[PDB]
Write a structure and sequence with these properties.
Belongs to the staphylococcal/streptococcal toxin family. This protein has 192 residues and is mainly beta. It has helices spanning 2-9, 49-52, 125-139; strands spanning 14-26, 29-36, 39-45, 57-65, 69-70, 76-79, 82-84, 98-105, 108-115, 122-124, 151-156, 161-165, 178-180, 184-191. The protein has two domains: 1-10 and 86-192, Ubiquitin-like (UB roll) (Roll); 11-85, OB fold (Dihydrolipoamide Acetyltransferase, E2P) (Beta Barrel), CATH 2.40.50. The relative contact order is 0.19. Bound molecules: a molecule of 4 linked components (NAG-GAL-SIA-FUC).
Amino acid sequence: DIFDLRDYYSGASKELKNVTGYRYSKGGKHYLIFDKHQKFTRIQIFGKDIERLKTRKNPGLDIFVVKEAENRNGTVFSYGGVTKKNQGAYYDYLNAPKFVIKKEVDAGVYTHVKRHYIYKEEVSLKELDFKLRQYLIQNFDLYKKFPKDSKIKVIMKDGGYYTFELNKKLQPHRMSDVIDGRNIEKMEANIR
Ligand SMILES: CC(=O)N[C@@H]1[C@@H](O[C@@H]2O[C@@H](C)[C@@H](O)[C@@H](O)[C@@H]2O)[C@H](O[C@@H]2O[C@H](CO)[C@H](O)[C@H](O[C@]3(C(=O)O)C[C@H](O)[C@@H](NC(C)=O)[C@H]([C@H](O)[C@H](O)CO)O3)[C@H]2O)[C@@H](CO)O[C@H]1O
């Protein structure tokens, strides 16, 4: 339902920094597990990230967590969103691509130009998708109308791009994909 899609992207998320993930696999699924305050978080890993993490112990990770499920032990489950922590040390954002939002209005389309500040060298598609939708829900009335063919496009300096179709959740198998934050040129959204 459209309201479940909205409530997903309006919900809580957290960025965990410099954590050590332990790799394993069960039933043909691949995971990274970590612990904090005597509690576990299990992250499912997808795509070719499955062998970028090919060692048991993986220090120095950043994880973007969106709770998908939680059990009685309080173990939280989330999909993808694992990146390497920054090698640099920064005092402000490292890139500020324009976010060009074309919003349908009465009798036309109105283009708003915003910035989206990037603080990470390696950024997951999961994090960008989630944060950009949440911003559009809060500020540009995303999901107050049915989204139809609405999309977000992230365009890289070399001309490569990534597309987020707004009529459904980001596909789980894409939630491990990572891009270089320094190389994003611009982002576009067309909103109903
Ligand atoms: C069943 C399923 O979940 N399949 C996933 C693919 O999605 C399915 O097929 C596509 C063609 C659409 O019909 C989807 O609705 C459908 O679920 C998924 O394919 C990717 O889908 C997205 C849109 O959802 C998009 O079309 C992808 O194409 C690009 C893009 O615009 O994002 C094309 C770009 O040139 C390419 N960029 C670069 C630099 O290569 C990107 C990039 O590869 C991906 O964005 C990375 O995630 O893709 C289309 O590939 C497929 C791969 O993401 O995952 C399937 O599990």
